[PDB]
Structure formats: C-alpha cells, structure tokens
Amino acid sequence: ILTQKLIDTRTVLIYGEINQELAEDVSKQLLLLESISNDPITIFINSQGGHVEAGDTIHDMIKFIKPTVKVVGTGWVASAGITIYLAAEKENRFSLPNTRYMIHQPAGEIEIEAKEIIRMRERINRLIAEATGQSYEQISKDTDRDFWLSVNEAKDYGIVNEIIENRDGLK
Amino acid sequence: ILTQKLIDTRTVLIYGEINQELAEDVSKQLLLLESISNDPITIFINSQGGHVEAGDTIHDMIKFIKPTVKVVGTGWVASAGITIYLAAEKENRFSLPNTRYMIHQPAGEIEIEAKEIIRMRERINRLIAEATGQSYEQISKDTDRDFWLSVNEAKDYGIVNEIIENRDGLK
Amino acid sequence: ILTQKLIDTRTVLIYGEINQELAEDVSKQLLLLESISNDPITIFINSQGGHVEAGDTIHDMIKFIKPTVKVVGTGWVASAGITIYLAAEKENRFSLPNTRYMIHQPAGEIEIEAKEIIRMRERINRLIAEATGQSYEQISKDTDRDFWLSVNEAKDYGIVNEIIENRDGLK
Amino acid sequence: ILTQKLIDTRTVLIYGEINQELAEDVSKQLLLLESISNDPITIFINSQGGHVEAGDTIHDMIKFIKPTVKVVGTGWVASAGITIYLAAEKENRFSLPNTRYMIHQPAGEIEIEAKEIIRMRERINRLIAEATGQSYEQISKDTDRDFWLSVNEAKDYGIVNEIIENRDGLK
Amino acid sequence: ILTQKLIDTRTVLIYGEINQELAEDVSKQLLLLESISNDPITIFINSQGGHVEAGDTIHDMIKFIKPTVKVVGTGWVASAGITIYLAAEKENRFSLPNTRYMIHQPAGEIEIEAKEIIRMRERINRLIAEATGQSYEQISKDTDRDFWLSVNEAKDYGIVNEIIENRDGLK
Amino acid sequence: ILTQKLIDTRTVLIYGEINQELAEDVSKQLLLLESISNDPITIFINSQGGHVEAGDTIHDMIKFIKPTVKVVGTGWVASAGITIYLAAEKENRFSLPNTRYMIHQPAGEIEIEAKEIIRMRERINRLIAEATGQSYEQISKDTDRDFWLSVNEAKDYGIVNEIIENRDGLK
Amino acid sequence: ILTQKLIDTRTVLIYGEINQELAEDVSKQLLLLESISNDPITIFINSQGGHVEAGDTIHDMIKFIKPTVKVVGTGWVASAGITIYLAAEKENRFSLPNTRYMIHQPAGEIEIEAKEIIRMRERINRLIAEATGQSYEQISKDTDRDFWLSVNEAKDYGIVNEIIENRDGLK
Amino acid sequence: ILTQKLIDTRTVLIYGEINQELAEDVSKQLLLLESISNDPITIFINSQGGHVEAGDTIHDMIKFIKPTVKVVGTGWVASAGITIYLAAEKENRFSLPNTRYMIHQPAGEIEIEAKEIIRMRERINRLIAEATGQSYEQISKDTDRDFWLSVNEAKDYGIVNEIIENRDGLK
Amino acid sequence: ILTQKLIDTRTVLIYGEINQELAEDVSKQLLLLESISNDPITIFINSQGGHVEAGDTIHDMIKFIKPTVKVVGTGWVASAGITIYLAAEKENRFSLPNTRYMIHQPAGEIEIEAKEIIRMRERINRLIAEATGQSYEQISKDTDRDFWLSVNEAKDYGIVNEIIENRDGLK
Amino acid sequence: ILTQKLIDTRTVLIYGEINQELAEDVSKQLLLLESISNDPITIFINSQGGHVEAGDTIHDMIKFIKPTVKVVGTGWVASAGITIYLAAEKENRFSLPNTRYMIHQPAGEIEIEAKEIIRMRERINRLIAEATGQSYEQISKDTDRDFWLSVNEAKDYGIVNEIIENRDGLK
Amino acid sequence: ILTQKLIDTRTVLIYGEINQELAEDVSKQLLLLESISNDPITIFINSQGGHVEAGDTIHDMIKFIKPTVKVVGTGWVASAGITIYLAAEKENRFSLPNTRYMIHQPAGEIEIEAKEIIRMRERINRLIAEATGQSYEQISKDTDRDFWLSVNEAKDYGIVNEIIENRDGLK
Q1: Where does residue I64 rank: exposed (0-12), middle (13-18), buried (19+ CB within 10 A)?
Q2: Which residues does residue C78 pair with via DSSP β-bridges, in sequence order?
Q3: What is the CA radius of gyration of chain C?
Q4: Which residue in G47, G59, G79, G95 is the catalytic one?
Q5: Mutation test of the interface with chain E: which of F3, F42, F94, F98, choosing the one with the most E Cβ atoms within 10 A?
Q6: Cβ atoms of B16 and A24 closer than 8 Å
Q7: Is the CB of residue K51 less than 8 Å from the CB of residue K19?
Q8: How many Å apart are CA D80 and CA I14, to the nearest integer?
Q9: Between chains, do J110 and D108 touch, taking CB under 8 Å as contact?
Q10: Alpha-carbon gap: G158 to the closest alpha carbon of chain H (Å)
Q11: What are phi and psi of C50, to 5 degrees?
Q12: Using a CB cutoff of 8 Å and minimum separation of 24, what contacts does I110-119 make?
C-alpha cells in the first residue's frame, strides 16, 4: 500500500538527467495511469536535460496518452527537460517560484554528423516556437548560446503560463 | 498488482542498447504475453542499436510468437533497432512524430572475420529490402555509410507505415 | 507494518548531501503524507548542503503542500540545507542543542556562467532575508565567506526560533 | 504469478556467455521443471560460448533429466554453446532463421596443459561427430580454425534438423 | 513456491570457486535439509577448487549431518573440490560422462608457513588415500604436480565409483 | 518459511573475516534466538580472524545472552576467531576433524599506540589462559609468533574439548 | 659546431604549444642573437596557441630586442600564436602557402576571474586591431567564435602581408 | 666527428609519426644543410602519417629551402607522409622496392569544425593532384576511403617516379 | 674515442623489437659506415621481430648501400627479424650455435585491411622464397602457423648458410 | 680518462636481469676489448637470470671473440646467468666466497609453444651437461625444480672450478 | 677536472638502498681505484640495507681488491649494509658519532625457498660472528628480531672499532 496511495495522486516525478532508462521509467508510469483512468496527470520536472532522443520519447508519450497532462517546473528545467515541459498545452504549464529555465542548441562521418545536428536543432527550435508562441527566427536567435531565464522571464517568454506557490494554484 | 495491470496493456518497451540481456528480458515478456492470450502486442522502440545477434533473436521472437505485434518507433531507431522494428508487418509499423531512423552496414582470422561481416551485411540488407519493399541493390547502395532518415523520409522509404500522435491513431 | 507505523509519525528525515535523488525521495514522502491527511509534518534536517536546484525543489515542495511543516535542525544545517530549513514558517523552526548553522554564497560561457552565479546568489540571499527578518544587505555582507553560527547565534540571527531538548518542546 | 505462468511454458533461455554462474542457473531451472512433470522442456540458445566445463555440465544435465529437451538456436550458437545445443536428440534440434553456427577447437605445467587441451579437443570433436553424424576425421579437419556456418549450411552439416519461423513449426 | 519445490528435490549445487561464502551457503542448505528429514541429499559439484579451509568445512559438514549424501561430479572437480567430493561414501560417488578430475598439492614466518603447508599436504593426501583405497605414499607421489584424470581414469583411481548418464543411474 | 525452519535449528555460522559488520549480524542473530527461548545455541566458526574489537564484541555477547552456547570449530579458527571460540565453556567446545587452530599476538602517537598494543596483548593472553587452562606464561611464550595447532594438538592444548565427526557427537 | 652554424642563420623556431617553458627557450635564443649582432632575426611559427601570458612574454620580447624580427607562418598560427605572430611589423609578416590562421576570444572568485578574462580579451583584441589595421569593433565582432582563415583570407584581413613559397621571397 | 661525417651525406630521415616535434627536428636539419651548401638533399621517408599541419610545415620547408630535395619512400608512406613525399619534384621521387603508399581524406563548434575539415581535404586533394598529374576529380574519388597502393601501382598513379634498389639508382 | 674504435669494427647490432625508432638508428649507422669506406659490414641480429614496415626499411637499406653486408643470427631471429636477416646474400648469412629461427604470416575498412594483409603476406613469402631457395609454394605452406626452426634445421631450410662458433668462422 | 683506465682493466660487469638491452651493452664491450688486444677479459657476474635468448647471445659472444674469457661469480648466478657463466672454459670459472648458484628448466599455439619450450630446455640442459661434465640425465633430473647450490656444492657439481677471495687468486 | 680531484681523495660513498645497480656502481669505483694505485680507500656507508646478494657482492669486492679499505659508518648501517661494513678488517672500521647499527635475520618451491632462507641466514650470521668476535650462537640469538645498537653499543659488540668526529681520527 506504499505506492497504492501514491498511484492515486496521479503524479510523476522527472528529477535528474534525461536518459533512456528514465524515459522507460516515465513511459511505464504514464501507460499505467492511462490504463487506470482518463483523469489528469501532474508531472513535476527538475532536470538539467541530457539525452535528446530520450527527451523526444517522453515528450511524444505525453501527447500520445489520452489523459491531459499538467507540468510543474521546479528547481531548473533545461534543454531536453524543456522539450518535455513543452509537451503540455500552454494552459497546463506551471512553475514553482524557485525555478530557472534554459533553452539552447544541444550537442550531438563529420559531414553526416553535422547534417544531423542541424536537422535536430531545427526540429527542436520549431518545437519551442510552436509551444511558446515565439517565432522560429526568435528562438533560433536566442538559442545561439545558453539562454537562461528566471521564472518571471520564462513566463513573459511563453514557456511558463502560471507561477504558483501552493496547491490551490493548480486548481 | 503493480505490473499486473501493465501486463494487461500488452505492451513491451525496448529502450536503449540492444544486447543479449535485453534480448532475454524481451523474450521472457513476449513468451509471457503469448502464454496469456493471442491478443495483439504493442512494442515501443527507442534504440540506437547494438549487438547484431541480439537484434536477430528479438526479430525472430516477434515472428515466432502467435500474437500479432505492432511496433511504435520513438526517439530513434537505428542499426539493430531497425532489424527489430522491421520484424512487424508493414501495416503494423507506426512512428511518433519526433523520431529519426538509420540504416547502415554494421561493424562485426581476418579472412574468416571478413567473410562473416560480408555474409552478415547481405543478410541484414536483404531483410531490410524484403520489409521495406525496396530493392536489395537500393538498400546495399544506401547503407554504404550512416544513412539517417527523418520520420517523413522513413515513411516514403517504406520503413514507417503511419505517423501517429495520439492513442486513436493506433485504432 | 514496518513503515506503516513510521508513516503514522508524519516524520521526514533529510540527512546528508542535498541532491536530485534525495529531492525525489523527499518529494514522494511529502506527497504521500499530504494525500493521507492535512495533519502537521515534522522534518529533521542534518545537512552540509549540496545541489542548489535540488534544495530549491525541496524548499518549494514544503510550501506547496497543504499540511503545515515543522523543521528541526540537528548536527549541522548549511548552504542548500538552510534553504530547505527556511521553507518553514518562523514559529515552526526548531533546533536540537548540538547543531551549528552556515550560510554563504554557493558555487555553481564564462560571462553566462558568471551572470547565473550572481542571479542565483541574489535569489538565495533574498530568500534568507525574507525568512530571517534580516535585511538583504546584512545577508549579502555576512554570506561573503562561510558564515558559521552556533545554535544560540542562529536563534539571535532569526534562523532558529526555539532551541528544544525534548519531545514536549515541539508541544 | 509473474514466473508462475512462465514456469508453465517450460522454457529455459540460455543467452550470453557460458560460465559456471549460468550453468548453476540453468541446472536449477531444469531440475525444477523435472520435479513438476515429465513434460518436454524447450531451450532457446543465443551464445558465443565461453567456459568449456560449464558447457559440459549443461550438456550432461540435459541428458540427465527425465524430460525430453528441445533446443532452438537463435542469433548465434558457437563453441561451448554448440556442445549444449548438441545435447538434444537430432529430432529435437531447431533453428530460427537469423542464426549462424560455429565450431572450433577451443582454447584452455605447459606439457600438462598441452596434454589436457589435446584430450579436451578430442572429447569435444567426438561429441560433435556423434551428434551430427559426421565422422571424427571430418570434424577434426573442419575445426582446425573458426568454422562458421549459415543456418542452411548448419542444417546440411547435421547440426540443425529443422529451420522454423513460427510456433506451429515446433509442432 | 519457487524454492519450495526445489527444496523437495533435496539437491545442493556446488558450482564455481570454493570459498568461505560458498561454504556458508552450502552449510545452511545442508542444515536446512537435515532439519526437514533424514532422506538422502544429492550434491552436484562443478568446481576448480579454491580455499582449502572452506573445502574442509564442506567436507566435514557432509559427514556431520545425519542424512546420507550422494555426490555427482560434473564438468570438472579439482583440488578443494576433490576434498568435498570424497566426503561421501565410495558407494555414493557418481559422475556425469563429461567430467575431468584433478588432485595436487595445493598452495598456501617462512619457516612457520612452510611447516603448515607440509602438514596441510599431509592431511589432504591421507584424506585422499583413505577415501580412494590407495596408499598415502602413492598419493604423495601422484600429487607432486597437477594430476589430471579423465572420468574413467578417476573411476580406476578410486575417486569415482559409477559413471551415470541418466536419472535411473542414481536408482 | 525459508529462514523460519533455519531459526528453529538455533545455529549461527561465523564464516570469514571478523569485522564490525559480521559482529552486528551475529549480535542480531544471538539476540533474536535469546528472545525466542532459553534453549542452547550452536555456533559453527570458520575464521582466519580480523578486527580485534569486533571479536571482543562477539565474545562478550556470547557470554551476555542467557542461552548456553556450544561452539564447533571447522576449517580454521585463528586470532580474533579464537577469542570468539573461547567464549564458550570448555565442556561446550567442539571441533570437526579437518580444522587447524592458531593463536598469536595480534597487530594494532607511537608511545600511545605501543601502550595500547601491549595492554591489548596482555588482555587477550589472559583470556586464552583462563579459557584453556594453560598458564599466562605459557600462552605469552607460545603467542610470540604464529602458533598453529592441528585438531589433536588443539585438544591437548585445552582449546578444543571434543573432536566430533557426526551429529550424535554433540549428543 | 652543430648549433654554431645554426646560430649564424639567425632563425628561431616556435613549434607546438605556447607555454612558459617555450617562452623561456625563445627568450634565451632572442637574447643570444641580440648579443651577437643587430642583424634581422627570422621566426618560423607553427602553433595552435596555449598559455596567454607566455605568448605575451614572447610578443613583448620580440619588440624589446634591438634586431628587426621577421615572422613566417607555417602549418597553423592560432590564438596565443597569433599574438606572437603580430609582434612583427606588417612589412615583415610572411606566410608559407599551406597555413591556416585563427583568432578567437581565449579562455582563462568567479566575479574576479570574469573581470580578468574581459580585460584580457580587450587587451588582446586591441593588440590585434593595431597590428592588422582593422578596427577594434571589427576584431571584437569576428573573435566571438573560432574565426579560421585560409592563407589568402588572412592576407586580405591584414594578418599576413606576403605569401611566399621560396627563400628569395624573403629577399 | 660522429655527426660530422653524417652531415656530409646530406641525408634526412623521416621515420615514424608526423608531429610538431618531428617538424621542428626536420626543419632544423634542412636549415642547417642549406646554410652549409646548396648541394642536393636526400630524404628517406617511413611514415604512417599523423598531424596534418606538421606535415604542411615539412612540405613547405622542403620547397622553401634553396637546395633541390630528393625523396626516397621506404616501408610505408601514408597520409601526412604522402604530403611530405609530394613536396619533391616528380623527377626526384624515388622508392625502395618494399614500400606501400596510401592516400585518404584525413580526420581533424561542429559547423566550424566541419567546414575546416572540408577545406583541409580539398587543399590536400589539390596538392596531390598537382604533384601526381591526376585530376582533382580522380583524387577526390580515390581518397573517399583508405586507398592503399603497392609500389608499382604508386608508380603508375604518379606518386613514385622511379623504383630503385641500389645507390647507383639515385645516380 | 669510445665509439671511434667501435665504428672501426664496422659492426651493427640489431637487438630487440623491430620498430621505426630502431630502423632510424640502424639506417643512420649503415649510412655512416657507407660514407667512410666500401669495406664489408657485419650485422648481429637478436630479434623476435615487430613492425613489418620497419623491417622492410632495414632490409631495403641493407641492399641499397654499397658495402657488402654479412649477417650473424644470435639468440633468435623471427618474423620481421627474418626479413632483415634475409637481405644479405646466402653466402653471407651466418649463425651462432644457440639461435632459433621463425617464419610466419604476420598480423596487420575490414575489406581494405584484409586485402592489404593478403598482399603483405604474399610479398613477404616471395621475399623468403627467393632468399632461401625454397619454392613460394613451400613457404606459403610452412608459414600457415608459427614455424620454428632450430639452427641446424634453419641451415637445411636455406635461411642460414654456415654455423660458426668463433671469429675465424667469418674468415 | 675516466673509462679509459677502466678499459685498461679489461673487466666487464654483468649485474642484474639478463635482457636484450644488457646483451647489447655486453656485446659492445666485448667487441671493443677484442679490437684493442687479444689479452684476457674478466667478467664479474651477479645475475638472477632473465631472458633466455639474451643469455644465449652473451654466451655465444663470449666464445665468438678471440680473447680468453674468465668469469667470476658473485652474489648469485642463476638461470640465464648460469648459461653466460658456463661460456667460459672450466679452468677459467671462478667464484667469490659469498655466492649461490641455481639451475632450472626456464619458463617460455599451445602445441607449438610446448614444442619450443621442450626443445629449449633440452638445449639448455645439454649446454650445462657439456660445460660441467655431468651427464645429460643428471642435469635433466636436477633441473626439474629450482636447484640451488652453495658455492662449495657448485664447485663439486662442476659449475665452479676455483673459489677465490683475493686478487692473487686469479693469478 | 670535477671528479678528477674527487678520484684523488680515494673515497667511495654507499648511501641508500643496497641493490644490484649500486653494487655495479661501487664495483666500478673500487676497480678503478685499484687500477690507479695500491693506496688505501675510504668508504662512507649510510644504508638501511636492501638486496642480500648485492651486499654479498660489495662485501666480497672489498676483500678481493688489493688496496686496504677503511669503512666509516654514518647515519645508519643495517642489514645488508652491515655485511658490507664488516668486509673491512676490525682495525679499519670507524663510525661517525650520529649513527645507529642494526643486525637481523633478513627476508627473502616454498620448501625450496625455506631451505634457501635458512642457509642464507646461517651464512650471514657466521659472517657477522667472524668479523665481530661474537660466537655464532650469540649472533643467532641476537638476530631473532630487529637488533638495534647505538654507536657505543656497536663498539662494545665488536662491529665498530673506533668512534671518530674529525679527519685526524682516521690518521
């Protein structure tokens, strides 16, 4: 009965480095909660990012499942973590006060590798633009280097919709 | 009761490097699900590839079991991962939006080793040809180096049959 | 029945290095206790600190949940550990007698990194100011180097509210 | 109930390096299934080989237990793995389509070691000869170096009796 | 129910290096089976040997317990493994067909150490003598170097009593 | 029910290096058995020794608990292992046949360390003298270097009381 | 007589990483050649860069001595190497045909370090601007990232004055 | 008088990996020999290649100095070694009989790095084209992978002009 | 004067592994002795072999220089060492009595490497055939595995011409 | 003038491990002394042995040169060192009083390796037999294990001819 | 001229660990000094000991050479250092005031090793008895453990003859 009442809260924690092992763990939890009901799921994210394709899977799984997903940013949300965060609809994107956000152009035969990283950076930047309401050209410009945003700046930028301190903030 | 409802979902996750340990885990899961019913099985694949013979085992196990197998490509599907992906019939090969695909001629007394790597590369290329509907000569030409395909390019090529974003896409 | 009666005590221990794994563990415990009842939660903290953003998550989680949280400092409470400690309301901040407290300006492209360390140090110092009743200028000055305070000095400083030796001290 | 239904399938998986730890695991599994009923046991083998005496134990345990043992080769079966594979009666030796097979003379005071390796290689070659129907001289000649066989070549050689793609193939 | 049926078989496996950890594991198994009934216990041994005093413990435990112990050599039995094998009465010493056996004078202030290794070798050679029926002088001579014996040579030597291939061999 | 019947045997195994971890494990087992009943406890010891203070704890715990403790030496019993062995009353000190015993003066600012090693050596020697019946002077002389005793020599010396080969030897 | 003839050529080679050891070596050679005569000195430079302050020393030593210094770029001249290269007057700056050039902003308590790197980057950029004839703002803009120039591009830019293939090109 | 007589032979050996240390060594020898007289210089080259810019320096220094340079390939001449080899005029390019030759496209932020590697390969391929008499397109095609030529093949390709066995072959 | 009289003996020692550093050393000595006079040179060789191309250089350098070269094998001459040894004319090939000789097929993208290793083995075998008077066929056959010859067997094979014990044996 | 007078002493020291580097050093010294005069040479040997083929070379070089060689054993002479020692004629084999001597059968695909070790051991034992006057059977028997001899026993055995303490002992 | 006047002093320093390299260095110095004149030689020894056989060589060389050798102990003289010190006649054994002395039984197929260590200890103890005037039985008793002597105790023991502080003390 230790995780029984935890499963009832319909909450997933994504804390730490984004990798395939974490993507598998998160995928299993989301698939389980979907099999139980169509009630909303809340995801808390504290992540510096990590593996791009692992980030892509979690993102797509969030949109794949039937239940509506709310995200709460906490501590920091960066890179691959941002891709996950942005899978939720703008209305459902929350942040705790002590959180900073970061977008950038991630790292990844040299001709083949260069082309892939270019295509990956385009795909990621179009994803960020579509989710935030910013233009593709604006994202491309800002993600030239490590672009760190405070919680209030990330709100103005269109990443965070609502800054909350308490439970009722989720309503 | 934790995995009991996740067994009911008839879902197998293949995330990360393909090796004999993963092959054993996947083989056990597929054999368990077959022993329960002949209902369809869904496999989510996120793999950069790995061990060729482990890939062959998973591929053959998919064809060996009675239940129909559906595959969903997510994040990336490359090398030995593709061999597993192509085990399902073309009708049952799906992909999530944020996925890239890759086929190549994989790495593997020198005269003995050379002959093995050639025979293996033929066997893999003919497997890909038969599955995608492409000619053996086309596959052999394209797999000369790391041949990366976007989700849409993978669809045209005959790897992916249908790109889906939601649950109802599996129908 | 082993943790069943331990859960009844509504107690969380935060001992050792603050990191994302501990934050996840602490988050799960708090969300579990919240789902059971709205009765007060007691946290015993013995921590030299560690990962700033993990400390931020725990701090914000304490304020996020409905139940009132009491903190009890033991051994030492320092750096990111102080951030967690200060999440509780002043009246609910207790210390055991053999405890020392430390505040400082923590550690963390060089221009970008320098800006982030500055902003982080501001954010942390303002958090400490608001919680202790000390002015931002006093905190900023004192945290210039490792600022250790005995238990009585920490009470005078506004970090600790009450020094207790026994159960009835919590009353 | 996770392994309960897996035990009913009477299937043993031998994937990876042959060693004493795997030999112990396989022995326990075979002795457990023997204690339940005299019904047949299916063994799937994907092995590059490994420890000669560990392979001898599994070989001899297969012939020691009362139930009839079917082997299915998958991915690759080589060296000590072949010795295990050949423990089954020719009638009961199956292969999945994507499998390659190898026989060689395995590696192993120097005079003593030389005599032991000679005796061991004789013992192994006679074992292979008896099981495949090939002459000792033919095996001895062919195993001089790493002798890789395709699935069809392995059938022609007398290692594999039947190549199967589906369940009803086992019949 | 998994080891419940395995305990019913009254079978102990001694596979791998002989050391104190394995001696503890085996001791617990032998004491557990002794506490249940006085029915015979079958031990399968595949061991290159290892720690002398750990082998002495297993040897003495086999004789110490009330139930009659049958030993079955498999793969190989050497050094400390032989000492364990010979704990059983001659009538109860069996071997699978693919097994080799080895006796030798094992490895072990220099004057003290020398005396101990001498006494240790004396003790072991007398134990082998008593168990096989051969004279102490003959054992001392044969154990001067690594003395490898095929299964049939071990039978002729008085180590193995009967070579069995099937279950009915133990009768 | 796997350790349930093993608890009924009232047997403790002390195999391997004597350290604080083992001392904790043994203390818990002895305390558990004491809490159940006042029936005798049998301890099998196979140990080369190790940490002096860990040995001291096990020794004192044996004498502390109410139940009578019988000790059975097996393989070897040396140094800190002997301190533990000698905690049992002479009448309750048994040995399996293949066992050797060793006593010596154990290894341990330099003036402080010298005094401590001196006092420790005296304390240990007086303990051995008292338990065996040998004089302190004889012990102090014999323990000057590694003093190994065969099973029969250890009986004469007063360490072992009865050499047993079977269960009924304990009567 | 080996270096005697080599000293007569009045040639200094700066090949490899710029560090204090190399700076000491170059300083000694320049001081030696200065003490002999006021005839021109030729320096061949093949350097990826290295230690900023070591480069500064070499640069300043080149200007400090009385003889006129000619520089010939070869292989590559980058970062700290460029600072050395630009110590010579524009008229005396040559390049062999197979050479590439690079200017960039080099890497270097955080507030202090950041301020120093800023000052260092201004100092270096002003040094480059003065030597090439480019404006400070142009250098500051171009050195934002790794600015690799071909030999012809470096001449146009104002780093190289004349590209030579033969001895008489120095004239 | 050891290197004195050796200096008269006017011979430079380039054996082993091409790096900056070797470039400095070779440069000094070439500059020393040029200062003594304008007589021809013979270079013996046995090199697998190495650092591209080191090879460029040596290549350019050969053309820079006044004396005519003859090259003799020996053992193998590959990659950066071939660049050095091709610094000599075609009439002055010799080979010993037991020599093989290799040209390829060498290995060398990712957009910046990819552009440099591309420019480097074009530069090397044009250099090879000019020196051999082969067209740029042929060289570009042939260097796609490791292109090993035997001594007679290198002669036909225009790398080697004359295969010599004895001194009189240099004439 | 320490090497002055050692150069007068016109003796070169090739002891140890054949590599490019040794090839440089040997090349310099041979060129030095050539420039002094046309008198014969004696080479003593004790080598297990090593780098194939380094052996090729030394072999070719021996045939390149004007003076007649005599070889004296000592201890062992194997692999690349044999290639060097066989550079001398048959009449000039000597051996000390305690020497053994070995020829084999040396070790050396996979299709490319395979082609190179095949060509290399043919080149070496033809070199050995021509020098010893054995047919290419015989050499090709004998070099299948490590082919060790005693000094008298090496003489019969045509590797060694004369076995000498004393100075006057060279005459 | 430092080694000039040391060369006048016509003494060679062979101290430490026998390897190819030492063999080269010793060969150069012997060849230098031979070129000066035909006067006798004295070798002092203190060696535990080492590389067999390096010892073979020194042995053969001692017999090869025209000057008569005297050997003086000191400290110890063992294995390969004994082979060197026995190169001198019996009359010329001396020992200092504090020396011990050892002969054994030295350590050294497995069928090929075993043959080589057997032939090598026979060669060494026949060398020892011939030098000492002992029969081959005696040497073969004694060298079965490490056969240590005191200086007087080594004299009796025919290894040492004369034990000397002072200069005039060489006479 | 640096060591020229140092050679005139006829002084040898033996400082640090006794090993074969130091034995060679010392041997060369003694032989050099012997070849120059028969004037006395002075050896200063500061050594904790080291390699027994190396000490034996130095000991024997001191007695072997014609000149008289005086030894001066300084700092410490222990173990193999003592063996060297005791090579000089009693009349010629001096000590500086701040020196301690130690004798003990040194450390060093286990039966063979034990036999060798016994013989070695006897040989060393007899050597020490003969040089000191102490009986063999007394030396054997005193060397049971590390036996340290002050400079004055060493004089009383017969190791040191005369304690000196100044040059004139050698007279």
Answers
A1: buried
A2: C102
A3: 16
A4: G79
A5: F98
A6: yes
A7: yes
A8: 45
A9: yes
A10: 21
A11: 150, -125
A12: I110/B108, I110/B110, I110/B113, I110/B114, I110/B117, I111/B114, I111/B118, I112/H145, I112/H146, I112/H148, I113/B110, I114/B110, I114/B111, I114/B114, I115/H148, I116/H100, I116/H148, I117/B110, I118/B111, I119/H100, I119/H150
Question: Strand, coil or helix: what is E19?
Answer: coil
Q: What chain I residue is nearest to J6 in terms of C-alpha separation?
A: I2
d(CA K42, CA C6): 82
Q: Which residues contact J144 (CB under 8 A, 6 or more apart)?
A: J105
Query: How far is the alpha carbon of A48 from chain C, nearest alpha carbon, in Å?
Result: 10
Backbone φ and ψ for G149, nearest 5 degrees, come out as -120, 140
Nearest CA among K112, A116, J75 for reference residue B102:
A116
Pairwise CB contact (< 8 Å): B27 & D44: yes
CA distances (Å), C97 to each of C48, C101, C164, J3, in order? 17, 12, 7, 78
Asked if residue I80 lies in contact with residue I18, where contact means CB atoms within 8 angstroms, the answer is yes
CB J108 within 8 A of CB J41: no
d(CA D77, CA D103): 9
Contact E46 D57 (CB under 8 A): yes
Residues of A with CB under 8 A from a CB of C: 2, 5-6, 8-9, 11, 13, 15-16, 44, 46, 48, 74-76, 96-100, 145-146, 148, 150, 164-167
DSSP 8-state assignment for residue F84: H
Tokens matching residue D132: 């495949």
d(CA I144, CA I101): 15
- Determination technique for this entry: X-ray
Residue E79 a catalytic site member: yes
Would you kindly state where each structural domain of chain H is located, as residue ranges? 1-171
**Coarse DSSP helix, strand, coil percentages of chain A, rounded to the nearest 5 percent:** 50, 25, 30
Q: Which chains touch I (3 or more CB pairs under 8 A)?
A: B, H, J
Contact H72, H78 (CB under 8 A): no
Alpha-carbon torsion F108, F112, F115, F116, what sign?
negative
Query: Which distant-in-sequence residues (6+ apart) come within 8 Å of B25 by Cβ?
Result: none
By 3-state DSSP, what share of chain H in percent is helix, strand and coil, each rounded to 5?
Answer: 50, 25, 25
Report the DSSP pairing between strands C41-47 and C69-78: parallel
Number of other residues whose CB lies within 10 A of the CB of residue I145: 11
Q: What share of chain G is helix, strand, coil (3-state, %, to 5)?
A: 50, 25, 25
Torsion angles phi and psi, residue A64, rounded to 5: -75, -45
The structure tokens 């050209």 sit at A137
Q: Which CATH number fits domain J1-171: 3.40.50.620, 2.30.110.10, 3.30.70.1140, 3.90.226.10?
A: 3.90.226.10
Please give the resolution of this entry in Å, rounded to 1 decimal.
Answer: 2.1
Q: How far is CA D147 from the centre of its chain?
A: 16
Q: By the 8 A CB rule, do G70 and G40 touch?
A: yes
Tokens of J118: 């057997």
H→G contacts (Cβ < 8 Å), by residue, are 3-4, 20-21, 23-24, 27-28, 31-32, 35-36, 53-54, 56-57, 59-61, 63-66, 109, 112, 115-116, 119, 123, 127
Contact partners for chain J, using 3 or more CB pairs closer than 8 A, are: D, I, K
Of K110, K117, K118, the CB nearest to E108: K110
CB atoms closer than 10 angstroms to residue H124: 25
Let me know: does A160 contact A73? Beta carbons within 8 Å: yes
- Beta-carbon contacts of F109 under 8 Å, excluding residues fewer than 6 positions away, are none
Q: Do C110 and G107 touch (CB under 8 A)?
A: yes
3-state secondary structure J78-115: ECHHHHHHCCCCHHHEEEEEEEEEEECCCCCCHHHHHH
